[PDB]
């Protein structure tokens, strides 16, 4: 145990906590039993690799259990497609161990430096959400250490389904996920076949994503112009694809198919042509880094699908705001799952990255308001400054969730800055 100052990736909202770090699960079981006996008393919260920007993995004046020591891969099985892994396993470790079995991590986020625990607790998503859903959809079982000190073996359709789906996306506030079983996606290669497309306006970007062409791709995302004024506003470089088969690989690659490996023109018409040519293509074979991985306030929201005029209004609001975001990711989500606090819903999702400067705070509070008004929501993994009232209206099943949480932790053994800020205890 060590008094430490914790922050999310965005290095904001620091608090000091007693960070327990042990590879012995039993010591984690005791640590919880010591907290549950001494009242709530600021409680405890699990931490993974600290990739949430927010305050969901910190607990000012309480216990923070570092789960990364507990990183044993117990088994992988290519016939069942199941991996059995401790919660502190990360998706890069997992991805590399699973490939020799013909198995693919079913949901990968923009970084592979996240733990399995954090992937479940934030119910993370990726470029294949419209074809695969989020991470919780592929969990077949997890062992949850609850406030009573018992370890419950939960399944998605068992008798404890309710607690299972409260843990999916429950930012650790139902207990510590010790271990889980995931169903992987079968693959014969570590490569993608990608199609690329460049649009010139927001209206075209929208139109490309509503042709029906998204149904031909399992992975899809886009880089998104949020600075340029209309008509350029919302032009995008779209990148869509599928996991390749061995047959579609070049000869050089079919022997190890599963192995993991002019500036004055830029803003002128010649730059426009180059960007469009380089960004337009078909059938390009790419490994994971090339396909998936090509001071600040990180902000992410989704607008339900039908509300397209509303989504266009929000992009216009951002462009006229005087806050310039260069690194913006756009994607059309597909169906949601049954976790009450799961962030993804079918509709228009986008991430923006704002330089911290005067007026930004108040401008993002207004963004919150328009996002809420238009039926959307923010992502806890990206947030540390929204209000409980805003969050509770964005998430109309919160009360349903809070009820489950109070049954399993009546003494508030599990707690985080986020839970206090967002009124989730």
> Residues interacting with ligand EQ8, by CB under 6 A?
110, 125-127, 221, 300, 327, 329, 331, 349, 351
- In this complex, which beta carbon is closest to ligand EQ8, that of residue 317 or of residue 327? 327
| From ligand FAD, ligand EQ8, none, interface partner of 114 (C-beta below 5 to 8 A by class) | ligand FAD
* Interface residue list for ligand FAD (CB under 6 A): 9, 45-52, 56-57, 67, 87, 109-111, 114-115, 117-118, 121-122, 124-126, 171-172, 176-177, 381
| From ligand FAD, ligand EQ8, none, interface partner of 50 (C-beta below 5 to 8 A by class) | ligand FAD
**Minimum distance between the CB of residue 102 and ligand EQ8, rounded to whole angstroms?**
24
| From ligand EQ8, ligand FAD, none, interface partner of 118 (C-beta below 5 to 8 A by class) | ligand FAD
How does DSSP assign 175-237, residue by residue?
BEEEEEEEEPEE-S-S-EEEEEEE-SSHHHHHHHTTSSGGGG-SEEEEEE--SSPTTTTT-EE
Quick one: tokens of 382?
Answer: 């990206």
Other beta carbons within 10 Å of 35: 24
| From ligand EQ8, ligand FAD, none, interface partner of 115 (C-beta below 5 to 8 A by class) | ligand FAD
Cα→Cα distances 336→1, 17, 101, 345, Å: 39, 35, 29, 5
- In this complex, which beta carbon is closest to ligand EQ8, that of residue 42 or of residue 209? 209
Helix (H, G, I), strand (E, B) or coil at 159: coil
Residue 382's contacts (CB-CB under 8 Å, 6 or more residues apart) are 52, 53, 54, 298, 299, 300, 351
**Minimum distance between the CB of residue 355 and ligand FAD, rounded to whole angstroms?**
17
Number of helices and strands in the chain (H, E): 13, 19
Q: Residues marked as binding?
A: 46-56, 110, 115-118, 122-125, 177, 379
Q: Residues marked as binding for FAD?
A: 46-56, 110, 115-118, 122-125, 177, 379
The rounded distance, in Å, linking the Cα atoms of 360 and 259 is 45
**Minimum distance between the CB of residue 291 and ligand EQ8, rounded to whole angstroms?**
10
The residue whose two tokens read 């099943």 is 397
| From ligand EQ8, ligand FAD, none, interface partner of 331 (C-beta below 5 to 8 A by class) | ligand EQ8
Residue nearest to ligand EQ8 (CB): 110
Residue 278's contacts (CB-CB under 8 Å, 6 or more residues apart) are none
- In this complex, which beta carbon is closest to ligand EQ8, that of residue 76 or of residue 381? 381
**Minimum distance between the CB of residue 127 and ligand EQ8, rounded to whole angstroms?**
5
**Minimum distance between the CB of residue 166 and ligand EQ8, rounded to whole angstroms?**
23
Residues of the chain with a following break (C to N over 2.5 Å): 261, 294
- In this complex, which beta carbon is closest to ligand FAD, that of residue 112 or of residue 209? 112
Classify burial at 118, counting beta carbons within 10 Å of its beta carbon; exposed 0-12, middle 13-18, buried 19 or more: buried
| From ligand EQ8, ligand FAD, none, interface partner of 46 (C-beta below 5 to 8 A by class) | ligand FAD
| From ligand FAD, ligand EQ8, none, interface partner of 349 (C-beta below 5 to 8 A by class) | ligand EQ8
């Amino acid at each position: 145990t060590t008094a430490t100052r914790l922050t999310g990736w965005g290095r904001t909202a620091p608090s000091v906590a007693n960070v327990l770090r042990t590879p012995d699960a039993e010591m984690i079981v005791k640590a919880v039993a010591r907290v549950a006996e001494s009242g709530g008393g600021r409680g405890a919260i699990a931490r993974g690799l600290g990739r949430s920007y927010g305050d969901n993995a910190q607990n000012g004046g309480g216990l923070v259990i570092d789960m990364t020591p507990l990183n044993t891969i117990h088994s992988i099985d290519a016939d069942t497609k199941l991996v059995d892994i401790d919660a502190g396993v990360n998706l890069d470790q997992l991805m590399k161990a699973a490939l020799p079995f013909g198995l693919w991590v079913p949901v990968l986020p923009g970084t592979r430096q996240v733990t399995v625990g954090g992937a479940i607790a934030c119910d993370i998503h990726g470029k294949n959400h419209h074809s695969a859903g989020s991470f919780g959809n592929h969990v077949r079982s997890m062992d949850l250490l609850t406030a009573d000190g018992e370890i419950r073996h939960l399944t998605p359709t068992g008798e404890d389904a309710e607690l299972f789906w409260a843990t999916v996306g429950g930012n650790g506030l139902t207990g510590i996920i010790m271990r889980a079983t995931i169903e992987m996606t079968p693959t014969s290669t570590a490569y993608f076949i990608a199609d690329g497309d460049v649009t010139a306006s927001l209206d075209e970007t929208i139109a490309l994503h509503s042709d029906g062409s998204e149904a031909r791709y399992t992975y899809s995302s886009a880089w998104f112009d949020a600075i340029s004024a209309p008509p350029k506003l919302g032009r995008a470089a779209v990148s869509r694809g599928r996991l390749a088969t061995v047959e579609q690989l070049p000869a050089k690659l079919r022997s190890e198919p599963l192995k993991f490996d002019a500036n004055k023109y830029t803003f002128g018409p010649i730059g426009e042509l180059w960007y469009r040519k380089s960004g337009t293509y078909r059938g390009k074979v790419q490994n994971l880094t090339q396909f998936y991985h090509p001071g600040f306030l990180q902000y992410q929201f989704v607008i339900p699908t039908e509300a397209v005029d509303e989504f266009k209004k929000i992009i216009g609001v951002i462009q006229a705001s005087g806050h310039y975001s260069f690194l913006n990711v756009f994607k059309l989500f597909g169906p949601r799952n049954q976790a009450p606090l799961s962030f993804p819903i079918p509709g228009w999702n986008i991430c923006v990255d704002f330089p911290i400067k005067d007026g930004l705070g108040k401008f993002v509070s207004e963004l919150d308001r328009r996002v809420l008004e238009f039926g959307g929501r923010l992502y806890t993994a990206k947030d540390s400054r929204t209000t409980a009232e805003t969050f509770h209206a964005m998430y109309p099943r919160v009360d349903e969730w809070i009820s489950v949480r109070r049954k399993v932790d009546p003494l508030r053994v599990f707690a985080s800055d986020m839970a206090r800020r967002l009124e989730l205890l």
